[PDB]
Amino acid sequence: RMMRWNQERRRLLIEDLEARIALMPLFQAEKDRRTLQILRENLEEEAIIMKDVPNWKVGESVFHTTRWVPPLIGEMYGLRTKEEMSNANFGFTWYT
C-alpha cells in the first residue's frame, strides 16, 4: 500500500511542479519588470539626493563589467521602506 500510495503521490508531485513550470514565465516577466522599477525608482531618489553631492554621478556600477547584474535585496529596499526591507529579509522565515 505504501508503495502504491507514494507512487500516486509522486505523480501528483509531478502534476503541480509542471503547473508552476507553466506559470513561471509570467512570473519572470513580472519579477523583472518590478525589479527594474525598484532600481529605477531608487534612481529618482538617488539623483534627488546625489545631485548636491560633489562630483558624484548619481549611480555607477561598483563593477566595471557591463553585464546585467541582479541587485541585492539590500540594494532594492535599503533606502525603501524599512518594513519592506524586513519583509524581504526575514519575511519567509517567519512565513504566515
Binding site: 500500500r1 508503495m3 507514494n6 507512487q7
Partner: protein
C-alpha cells in the same frame, strides 16, 4: 488572535495535564482493587488542583547548593515540554515548521540537561549518581529514538510532521513499520522515565527530585506528565494516523483525542503491570536488543523505497 491560539494549546493541555495524574491514580487503583481518589470534590476531579496548591505553599526548602540551577533547571523541564506542543500537527499545527520532527527531537534532547543540572545542584553525592542514571539512559535511548524516526521520515519524504497526515490518508504507518512502532513505544516509555524504564526515582529513593520539594518538584513534575502526553501524541501522529477529512478538521482531532488517551492509558497500564528493569538491564536492551534491530531496519527503509520504486514525494 494568535495570542488566543496560544492560550488554547497551552492551558487546555495544562488542564488536561492535571487530569492525567487523576486518571493515573484511579486506573492504577481499579487495577489494584481500590477506588482511588474520589472523596475530594466529585469523583476526585478537584484532586489534582488540591495537591498543586499544597505543593506551592510548602517551603521550597532550597535545602549547600549551586542556587541558579536549583531554579533554572525546573524551568527548563516545563519550558521544553510545553514548547514541544507548539508544532504538533493536531489537525493544523500552530507554528508549522518545515523541519518539525528535528525540532521535536532536538527539544527532547535538551531535557536531559535538566536532569544533569538538578543532580549536580543538589549537594548529595547520592543525587549526583542518580542524575547520571537518567542522563545516560536519556542519550542512550535517544540514539535508537532518532534512528527510528529517520526510518519513518524516509517513508514520509520530509521532516515536517504535517506531511504524515497526507502520507497516512489510506493506511496507518503501523501496518508498515509496526516493528518500529513497538520500538518507538518502548523508547517513548524510557524517555518519559515511566515505569518499565523508571530507574530514576528508583531504589535511589523509591534521583533528581531527591532535594526537590514544593514548587520545583511541581514544575518538573508537570513537565513529565505533559511529556507523557506529548510523546504518546507523537505516536498518535507518526504511527497511528487519525483519519483526516479536509472538510471537517475536528474528526482528525477527535480521533487524535481517542488514540492519544488510549496510548497514554497504556503507559499507565504498563506501570502497574511490570517490575522496573535493572540499570544495565535497561542499556542491555537498547544497545544489544534494539540498536541492531533499528540500524538494520533503518537500511530496509532506505531500500524499501528504491526497489519498490516508492521514493516518497518531497513536499
Amino acid at each position: 488572535m494568535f495570542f488566543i491560539n496560544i492560550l488554547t494549546l497551552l492551558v487546555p493541555i495544562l488542564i488536561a495535564m492535571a487530569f492525567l495524574t487523576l486518571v493515573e491514580r484511579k486506573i492504577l487503583g481499579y487495577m489494584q482493587l481500590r477506588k482511588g481518589p474520589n472523596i475530594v470534590g466529585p469523583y476526585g476531579i478537584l484532586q489534582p488542583f488540591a495537591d498543586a496548591m499544597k505543593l506551592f505553599m510548602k517551603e521550597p526548602m532550597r535545602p549547600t547548593t549551586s542556587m541558579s540551577l536549583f531554579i533554572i533547571a525546573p524551568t527548563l523541564s516545563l519550558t521544553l515540554a510545553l514548547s514541544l506542543w507548539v508544532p504538533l500537527p493536531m489537525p493544523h499545527p500552530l507554528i508549522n515548521l518545515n523541519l518539525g520532527i528535528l525540532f521535536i527531537l532536538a527539544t527532547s534532547s535538551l531535557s536531559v540537561y535538566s536532569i544533569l543540572w538538578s543532580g549536580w545542584a543538589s549537594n548529595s553525592k547520592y543525587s549526583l549518581f542518580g542524575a547520571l542514571r537518567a542522563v545516560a539512559q536519556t542519550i542512550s535511548y535517544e540514539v535508537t529514538m532518532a534512528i527510528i524516526l529517520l526510518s519513518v521520515l524516509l517513508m514520509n519524504g520530509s521532516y515536517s510532521l504535517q506531511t504524515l497526515i497526507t502520507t497516512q490518508e489510506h493506511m496507518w504507518l503501523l501496518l508498515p513499520a509496526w516493528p518500529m512502532a513497538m520500538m518507538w513505544f518502548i523508547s517513548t516509555l524510557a524517555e518519559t522515565n515511566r515505569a518499565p524504564f523508571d530507574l530514576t526515582e528508583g531504589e535511589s529513593e523509591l534521583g533528581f527530585n531527591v532535594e526537590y520539594a514544593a514548587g520545583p518538584f511541581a514544575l518538573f513534575f508537570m513537565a513529565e506528565y505533559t511529556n507523557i502526553i506529548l510523546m504518546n501524541a507523537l505516536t498518535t501522529i507518526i504511527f497511528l494516523g487519525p483519519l483526516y477529512y479536509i472538510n471537517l478538521p475536528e474528526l482528525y482531532s477527535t480521533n487524535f483525542m481517542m488514540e492519544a488517551l488510549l496510548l497514554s492509558s497504556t503507559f499507565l497500564w504498563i506501570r502497574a503491570s511490570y517490575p522496573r528493569f535493572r540499570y544495565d538491564q535497561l542499556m542491555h536492551l537498547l544497545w544489544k536488543n534494539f540498536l541492531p534491530l533499528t540500524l538494520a531496519l533503518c537500511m530496509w527503509h532506505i531500500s524499501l523505497p528504491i526497489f519498490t520504486a516508492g521514493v516518497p514525494p518531497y513536499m
